[PDB]
Ligand binder design. Structure first.
Ligand code: DCP
Ligand code: CA
Ligand code: CA
Ligand code: CA
Length: 341
DNA sequence: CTAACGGAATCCTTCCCCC
DNA sequence: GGGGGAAGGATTC
């Protein structure tokens, strides 16, 4: 195949720069405020001016303000970024009917029936970049290869506003030389257990027997890495459909009293049913983050659709099921609806 | 009422009822 | 032995 992958460069921060061009060239930090104390939260993303000094996603806001006290700390307007994302995704549909929208800033395009060789695909990536830069003024990164994995790897390399094509020969040397921690789907928990087995490259998974690797990362993760190592990975581009919608808020204080959690729980249901917008769900899940950021969830599925009033009375029973089966105090409480019609 | 941490999705793994 | 569902986990954005 020939897969064209698009990744929006610092999406949340760049959209804020488009709406306010005076922020250009200045370190911008898009923050997610929680509401406990002031400056409590994490960094959603930051532009490359702020990311030079280590201000990247995940770090707390207070820790980022000690590195860059004079930076622009804007609240996260996710809906504004979603509207911009939606308009850009419609621009990509003109180039391929087979499109796979991964996240809010990632989209896979199967251009196997639109270009001949990789050079023509490279020219198509330039045409796509110059089109998003024209209509929406957003710089993106294009990664082109033979499957979805290496297309994302090609974009991860020439990340800041670039375009990279990994031909069939560079794929061969990457199976032998690329660090396996930089493979999509390989986080710290599994990458550490691969070094325990002595696997630092993709080709290492072909020497170790299957069950030795199967018992440490699982059957799916084992067959997935071996598929990439054998140069036999070719999962097709598929249209993704949202399978769940959730909203979870942070309470003012850690509490186990039911009547104190119900306002936050009912607040999540209102904001969750608003984000539903048609689509009647058949299951409701009450999600509670414990005192030490551990996740607990008690679900419930119905043979019919769930109404707003039903989600109200049923979430209380699911919430009580959490307090009866867990002694830790709750930090965040929320609701996730799945199994649509 | 301002305290060492956000919110939101996905697929996979384990455990267990069940044919 | 395997299908299929609830709850936890790892991943990534
Ligand atoms: N832990 C994270 C990581 C990312 N995001 C959001 C902010 C980003 O704008 C978007 C995509 O993040 P990327 O991982 O693609 O990183 P950026 O797009 O911010 O920059 P770059 O693509 O250069 O890494 O998702 C988030 O909320 N939380
Ligand atoms: Ca991305
Ligand atoms: Ca990006
Ligand atoms: Ca990684």
């Amino acid at each position: 195949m020939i897969v064209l992958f698009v990744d929006f460069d610092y999406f949340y921060a760049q959209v804020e720069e488009v709406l306010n061009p005076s922020l250009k060239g200045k370190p911008v930090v898009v923050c997610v405020f929680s509401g406990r104390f002031e400056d409590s939260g994490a960094v959603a993303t930051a532009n490359y001016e702020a990311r030079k000094f280590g201000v990247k996603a995940g770090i707390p806001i207070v820790e980022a303000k000690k590195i860059l006290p004079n930076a622009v700390y804007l609240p996260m307007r996710k809906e504004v970024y979603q509207q911009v994302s939606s308009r850009i995704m419609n621009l990509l549909r003109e180039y391929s009917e087979k499109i796979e929208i991964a996240s809010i800033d990632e989209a896979y395009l199967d251009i196997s029936d639109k270009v001949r060789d990789y050079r023509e695909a490279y020219n198509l990536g330039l045409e796509i970049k110059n089109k998003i830069l024209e209509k929406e003024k957003i710089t993106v990164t294009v990664g082109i290869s033979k499957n979805k994995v290496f297309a994302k790897i090609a974009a991860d390399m020439a990340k800041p506003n670039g375009i990279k094509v990994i031909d069939d020969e560079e794929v061969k040397r990457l199976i032998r030389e690329l660090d396996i921690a930089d493979v999509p789907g390989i986080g710290n928990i599994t990458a550490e257990k691969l070094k325990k087995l002595g696997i630092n490259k993709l080709v290492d998974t072909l020497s170790i027997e299957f069950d030795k690797l199967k018992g440490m990362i699982g059957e799916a993760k084992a067959k997935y890495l071996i598929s990439l190592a054998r140069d036999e990975y070719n999962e097709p581009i598929r249209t993704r459909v949202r399978k769940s919608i959730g909203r979870i808020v942070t309470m003012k204080r850690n509490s186990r009293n039911l009547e104190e959690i119900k306002p936050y729980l009912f607040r999540a249901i209102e904001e969750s049913y608003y984000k539903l917008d048609k689509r009647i769900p058949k299951a409701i899940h009450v999600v509670a983050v414990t005192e030490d950021l551990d996740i607990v969830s008690r679900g419930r599925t119905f043979p019919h659709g769930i109404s707003k009033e039903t989600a109200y009375s049923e979430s209380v029973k699911l919430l009580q099921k959490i307090l009866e089966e867990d002694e830790r105090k709750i930090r965040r409480i929320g609701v996730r609806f799945s199994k649509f019609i």
